[PDB]
């Protein structure tokens, strides 16, 4: 089963053939990170994580399943609210 | 821009072919049976920082 977050947090915080072989699948973990970025109407998102014993790589292991008319209705509400915000209010964020 | 996006859509519609039959594919299920990997539940931002610092 699962494991508390403090352990893997300590794993990443305190830090070689077993360390070398797990580094091959890095862009796959990048893809699994990028396909589960949270929606604008969500504040936090809690996802499962697969991780190596030394913290070599961390995976996401979840497919972003949604119901299609609910998803379209939610993005239409986003469209309405952002039209409302530009007709009411702009400062773009400073990059990196 | 409309005409070029419609060009890409017509190319993706014309070049479409049915995918080849194969065995069902599970990378993370084979990763889970290995004792070198553990599972947990984390916030998105924390694992997003962990992935980029591991890549660095």
């Amino acid at each position: 089963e699962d494991m508390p977050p403090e352990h893997v947090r300590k794993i990443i915080r305190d830090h070689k053939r077993v360390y070398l072989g797990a580094l091959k699948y890095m862009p796959h973990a990048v893809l699994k990170l990028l396909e589960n970025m949270p929606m604008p109407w969500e504040q936090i998102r809690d996802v499962p994580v697969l991780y190596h014993i030394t913290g070599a790589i961390s995976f996401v292991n979840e497919i972003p399943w949604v119901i299609e008319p609910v998803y379209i209705s939610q993005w239409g509400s986003m469209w309405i609210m952002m039209r409302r915000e530009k007709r009411d209010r702009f400062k773009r964020m400073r990059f990196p | 821009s409309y005409q070029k996006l419609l060009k890409y859509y017509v190319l993706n519609a014309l070049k479409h072919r049915p995918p080849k039959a194969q065995k069902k594919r599970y990378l993370f299920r084979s990763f889970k049976a290995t004792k070198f990997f553990q599972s947990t539940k984390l916030d998105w931002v924390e694992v997003g920082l962990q992935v980029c610092r591991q890549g660095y």
């Binding site: 053939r17 072989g21 | 990378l27 084979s30």
Partner: peptide, 23 residues
């Protein structure tokens, strides 16, 4: 020696999806 054998077994298992058709 054990860890490389485990990752080689996982590589062979990922190659098992198309093994009898490709070779």
């Amino acid at each position: 020696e054990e860890a490389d054998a485990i990752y080689a077994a996982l590589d062979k298992r990922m190659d098992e999806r198309r093994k009898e058709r490709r070779e």
